[PDB]
Write a protein that binds this ligand. Structure first.
Ligand code: VZ2
Length: 268
């Protein structure tokens, strides 16, 4: 829960404004430990309609304890400002890492495997991420891959049952993972050139997207397995960890430092 006694302005120093996000996000330092943290500051008088959503995200993150989910350290409330203290990951988001150029299939498989480990954790804990996309997958400077920015309980990554405002479950994350696989391979999710309101009707109406281009058969098959219109027919995260695409192509996460280094030199 939130600390209303301690002054976060004395506990933390802001180092950099980051997260170009709801509320302002900073790379910061815990003055006592000298560990770097991510700090989101939300003015609760400005964000009154979103307060329950904020509380729900804090609650879910506070219940997670996994190397695959960005850690929640705590929160502070000073005057009208809520400070949320999180683990800082310095490598970049998976979306950021698409900037230098296309990923190879080893990089795609490695990132997907780690996302699957986070989904396996969340689904085993009766949680649903709800916003799996490359922008919400964060890498440490060592190549560790973690999930961030859970969705509240833009349409391009949403499963058809979620769009139809129907009951849904963890299988919605598997659909979003399939869209994210396309995004990691092509740079953008399907329908990215279309107005979001048109995408709202296309996703439930149309056959599921496919991965188009010169990619290995197992990668195309991985995408196809995830993007089943029927949620019950999508595999679980545990099953996808055994998929031929993953087993044949995923490697040690430390190899992703080469991708991180490339982004240091080629970025907007
Ligand atoms: C409303 C609510 C309720 C509960 C928690 C939060 C919340 C969600 C996410 C976070 C957050 C953490 C975070 C950790 N590392 C990084 N590393 C930056 C990577 C990119 N680089 C590299 C060089 C400089 C730079 O910019 N960025 C983080 N970002 C910003 C990116 C979001 C992507 N979707 C966060 O927003 C927090 Cl603190 C609280 N929110």
């Amino acid at each position: 829960s939130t600390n209303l006694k301690a002054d976060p302005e004395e506990l933390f120093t802001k180092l950099e404004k980051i997260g170009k996000s709801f509320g302002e996000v900073f790379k910061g330092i815990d003055n006592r430990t000298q560990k770097v943290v991510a700090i989101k500051i939300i003015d609760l008088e400005e964000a009154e309609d979103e307060i329950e959503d904020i509380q729900q995200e804090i609650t879910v993150l506070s219940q997670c304890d996994s190397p695959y989910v960005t850690k929640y350290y705590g929160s502070y409330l000073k005057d009208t400002k809520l400070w949320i203290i999180m683990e800082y990951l310095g490598g970049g988001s998976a979306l950021d890492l698409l900037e230098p150029g296309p990923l190879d299939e080893t990089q795609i498989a490695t990132i997907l495997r780690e996302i699957l480990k986070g989904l396996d954790y969340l689904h085993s804990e009766k949680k649903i991420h709800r916003d799996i996309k490359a922008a919400n997958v964060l890498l440490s400077e060592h190549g560790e891959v973690k999930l961030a920015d859970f969705g509240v309980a833009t349409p391009f990554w949403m499963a058809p049952e979620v769009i139809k405002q129907s009951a849904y479950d963890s299988k919605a994350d598997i659909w979003s993972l399939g869209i994210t696989a396309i995004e990691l391979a092509r740079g953008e999710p399907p329908h990215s050139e279309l107005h979001p309101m048109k995408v709202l009707f296309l996703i439930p109406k149309n056959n599921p997207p496919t991965l188009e281009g010169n990619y290995s058969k197992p990668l195309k098959e991985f995408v196809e397995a995830c993007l089943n219109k029927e949620p019950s027919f999508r595999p679980t995260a545990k099953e996808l960890l055994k998929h031929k695409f993953i087993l044949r192509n995923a490697k040690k996460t430390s190899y992703l430092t080469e991708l991180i280094d490339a982004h240091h030199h080629h970025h907007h």
